[PDB]
Design a protein around this ligand. Structure first.
Ligand SMILES: O=CCc1ccccc1
Ligand SMILES: O=CCc1ccccc1
Ligand SMILES: [Cu+2]
Ligand SMILES: [Cu+2]
Ligand code: NA
Ligand code: NA
Ligand code: NA
Ligand code: NA
Lengths: 620, 620
């Protein structure tokens, strides 16, 4: 009965039928995106209305449509024809992944380039890469993918070990035309294989690892009701799934004695982008938005017990809509479990003689997605003490190139002749805050050093300052690790027992933001990535930091356009947008398959409770 | 037979006898420090010589001595009388902890101050606090402790809930004189109790937590030989214990196929300091060096199975020397165990069809210490992929004060009338590097942004620069999070298969360093804490960043004096000193006992291996 329940197969089937009856789902149509809409502010009417948003592609060249449907009432609410030269192209379709390779296989310029390199076309894989917006006037309003080539020596070979450098092609996937084939020169195709399951490369497997057994003999401490509502150690929330964003957390709240206290209304990773820093024309256009362009949720893995998730695991299997409106289940796509997390609090007192130890634990909600060469794990953690944490785990295979003779300032060498271009992985967390309710504000907190002198005669004093962000135009902030900068989200109308406003503090990792030149195409299209923190006033239609249609959008959509409204955010319904990322100079140890590296952020209570919230944890 | 073995009870007993026979351990003597010395460079002579360093205090006022003893040969090697006004006082003795309270209990000024506040002297606890060096000329060359008072309402009461503000006293612990009693005015003693085991405060304990069972049904994957030599998943090391430093790691090496490759010769936390930022005269002198002044190893806790360490635990029980040279065992003072650590590497490939998942794990070596109100866990982690990490976990009870009427810029309010002064916890890691041997160098690595223009026409390029630190005078470095600054320790004479020098990268957390004014006493005595990274040339006697005798040393000892030698560090035997810390503005949730907060650092391989070192990990 909950409005935040996962989409069911039956709901997806009704959308397909509603679209079909209305004449919007003909044979030349493809669903590029389908997702359930959140209830609007003021859901306290109990009037259930489940609405779905649909992006409909047309493979015959007609204009795509954005459609909103009520599955409860069986009606089309709105249907808009899109001018893609204006507002952007629709997300990449999984069925287009193979079309780039197949179109190039019959193009005379592509075949001439492969023949010069003595490459058999049947062995050449072509990655289907998003195009961006650059200098090619003929691409405006056309659906373009770019292709880079890799050789598979045999069907189980890792093609990433064998990039074909000096060659790139552009393809119009609707008209099935190869618009350009650029060949800048012959590079040797690196010869060593990268087959990390080949015993020749792994050597004899270790026999030294003994098993670690994690069991819960009485079952887990959390309960799941209504398919996706979790209660665990005073926490309460709903676990959503969206084909674009992946796992979304709703209605994060904490039961403080008698009262259920809201903390976060909606938490998601609303965009992620991988910009490449190699100035070669073969790759200098390369920036892929795995969320906005490819939709990370549709490529979620089925997670296997004992391997991907270890312990007493509860699974969710979300349902999404294929290019034709049929439901399919991502079996075991979300893992949920609790984990021991070491010591929570400990003290042995010299005067009372009391010895006290308590253990911590965390609730884990996670999924793993695979987009081409890269694989990412998304992890949300809830801790006993009120801390909320997000962690992204990056693994997979690094994107490769040739390593030029005489070296490179923008590419690392991984193996003889094999390079890996420098790049970043930058995420945007969208946190629709609800600290004790919707009247919230953000303060920026800096450490303050003090000069030795009157009132500070020994030169030991230091302090802090807090600056309230009152309008959107002043809420675009940068990190400052040297001054210990954090941001506090507080509720000025809800005080703790010391008559201080309740709050939560956001702790960033203070990694570098977008490194590209501010005048570049990617700085315009990924403007969110140039600053660490943005605060906007809540609005139903301000969902993504990059706008609704990221693919081949010319720039400036999303956050720079939102904040130009300069709305009041001092004690209002607000959304915090946090940029965080990894800057990756690949190392030899990243090849041929990369050990996990991590990045994330956390929020800790800051006077939210009237004392430690874990005094009632028992002694194990 | 290993020279790095833990001290045994028999060795301690021989030292005591050697000292006694030589006439250095009379009845007025106290051992303030006793520790085994590391073998000198060039231990490849197999000539075992176990030497111990001893600091001997004299309670009758005679000059203390520093003594070096050979337990193998039964001889005193050297014995030096110390001028403490020059080189500093000896570390605080545990037997002096009670002397401050007992001396004040019979002082008429102290009793007059308590009587004005209607405090019964039998209920007043006095913390024995290190004195530092300030404006009091009469303290030079005298052994001084300062005392701050706290009320215990009954024997099991938490005295920290009841600070007596406006009152401080100074005590000469050798002559048993109260030198000064300063009373700046009456503050109400905060009345609420802080008894975190009182059911009145905890409420009913939770019944919702179900057990988490961690077992290793075939035992652990690591082996322990010779009492303290560990081998685990290609790692090899020796676990030392020193009464000042605590757990010390020796001879950290990694078995890469046929070859045992050194990485770190010696790793320790060589100092830690807690400076307070409250300008009140009652506390503005307060800065305690838990390592250098109090010796964190002698206050190590006995760790209990299931509570402090969970899983299949192997314990070490180190032996130390009491004030009289008798051995005693810290039973179960070090926990060692392996932990599952999630996903190591994962990829599902669209072209090969291969699905690959491997799990990570880490080896944990830890101890917990308690110094008055504070408790710290020290954790060293070894990961499968070659990563080394250190984590400090801070808990215990925050140091309290009154909260002044009308507020404070330097104190947080925790409860009505109860404050917590701002402070930092700053650590110094001493890493005697041995990357593939002793010929090492340090490079500072910064991200380099590039301007859009010729050679970078799309404005996407970015790069990195490395600066070799060649002399000690240029090896005092600051963090720069905004430019992604890291430091690489490399061996210029050992190349990987791409003919690049092997290396490890140090990743800092980039937290603020010492906030005090540069002209302050604490900036002079804790100079190490003002900069993030120092590199020195190895020397046997350059052990601590603050020098050998931290207590009441006037300043400038340790690292500022070492680096003035301006020695060559470009391809030499070097030591990296990393400063890292927490800046603590206490929150309500820290009271009445603080949930763990953490800080640390890690080192990752950077071209140390010729490819990923975990390709031979089996599939669980
Ligand atoms: O991650 C999206 C870019 C991509 C997609 C498919 C194959 C390789 C790379
Ligand atoms: O941590 C060392 C300072 C200290 C020592 C003993 C009691 C309280 C505080
Ligand atoms: Cu990367
Ligand atoms: Cu603290
Ligand atoms: Na446009
Ligand atoms: Na909000
Ligand atoms: Na001196
Ligand atoms: Na060294």
């Amino acid at each position: 009965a909950s409005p935040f329940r996962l989409a069911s197969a039956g709901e997806i089937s009704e959308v397909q039928g509603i679209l079909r009856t209305a004449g919007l789902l003909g044979p030349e149509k493809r669903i590029a995106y389908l997702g359930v809409l959140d209830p609007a502010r003021g859901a306290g009417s109990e009037a259930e209305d489940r609405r779905f948003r649909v992006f409909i592609h047309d493979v015959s060249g007609a204009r795509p449509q954005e459609v909103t449907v009520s599955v409860t009432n069986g009606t089309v609410i709105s249907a808009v024809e899109l001018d893609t030269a204006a507002t952007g192209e629709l997300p990449v379709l999984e069925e287009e992944f193979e079309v780039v390779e197949q179109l190039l296989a019959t193009d005379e310029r592509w075949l001439k380039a492969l023949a010069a390199r003595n490459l058999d076309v049947s062995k050449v894989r072509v990655a289907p890469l998003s195009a961006g917006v650059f200098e090619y006037a003929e691409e405006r309003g056309r659906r373009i993918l770019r292709g880079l080539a890799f050789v598979q020596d045999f069907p189980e070979d890792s093609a990433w070990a064998h990039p074909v450098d000096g060659l790139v092609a552009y393809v119009d996937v609707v008209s099935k035309e190869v618009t350009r084939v650029i060949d800048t020169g012959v590079f040797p195709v690196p010869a060593e294989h990268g087959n990390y399951t080949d015993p020749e490369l792994t050597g004899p497997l270790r026999t030294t690892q003994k098993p670690i057994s994690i069991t819960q003999p009485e079952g887990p401490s959390f309960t799941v009701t209504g398919g996706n509502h979790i209660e665990w150690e005073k926490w309460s929330l709903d676990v959503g799934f969206d084909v674009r964003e992946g796992v979304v957390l709703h209605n994060i709240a904490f039961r403080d004695g008698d009262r259920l206290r809201p903390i976060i209304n909606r938490a998601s990773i609303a965009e992620m982008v991988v910009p490449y820093g190699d100035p070669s024309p073969i790759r200098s256009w390369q920036n892929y938005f795995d969320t906005g362009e490819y939709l990370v949720g549709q490529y979620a893995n089925s997670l296997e017990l004992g391997c991907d998730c270890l312990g007493d695991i509860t699974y969710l299997s979300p349902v999404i809509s294929d290019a034709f409106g049929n439901p399919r289940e991502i079996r075991n796509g979300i893992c949920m479990h609790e984990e021991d997390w070491g010591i929570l609090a400990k003290h042995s007192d010299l005067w009372s003689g009391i010895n006290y130890t308590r253990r911590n634990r965390r609730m884990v909600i996670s999924f793993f997605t695979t987009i081409g060469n890269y694989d990412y794990g998304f992890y949300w953690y809830l801790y006993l003490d009120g801390t909320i944490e997000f962690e992204a785990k990056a693994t997979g295979v690094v994107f490769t190139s040739a390593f030029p003779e005489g070296g490179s300032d923008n590419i690392s060498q991984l193996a003889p002749g094999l390079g890996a271009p420098f790049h970043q992985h930058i995420f945007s967390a969208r946190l629709d805050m609800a600290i004790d309710g919707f009247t919230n504000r953000v303060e920026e907190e800096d450490v303050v050093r003090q000069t030795m002198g009157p009132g500070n005669e020994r030169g030991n004093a230091f302090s802090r300052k807090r600056t309230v962000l009152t309008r959107e135009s002043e809420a675009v902030r940068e990190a400052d690790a040297r001054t210990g900068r954090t941001w506090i989200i507080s509720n000025p109308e809800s005080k703790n027992r010391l008559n201080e406003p309740v709050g939560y503090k956001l702790h960033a990792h203070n990694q570098p933001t977008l490194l590209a030149d501010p005048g570049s195409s990617i700085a315009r299209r990924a403007a969110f990535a140039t600053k660490d923190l943005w605060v906007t006033r809540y609005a139903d239609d301000e969902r993504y930091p990059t706008g609704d249609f990221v693919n081949q959008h010319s720039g400036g959509a999303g956050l720079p356009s939102y904040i130009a409204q300069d709305r009041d955010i001092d004690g209002q319904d607000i959304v915090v947008w946090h940029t965080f990322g990894l800057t990756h100079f690949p190392r030899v140890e990243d090849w041929p398959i990369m050990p996990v590296d991590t990045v994330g952020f956390k929020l800790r209570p800051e006077g939210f409770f009237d004392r430690s919230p874990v005094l009632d944890v028992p002694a194990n």
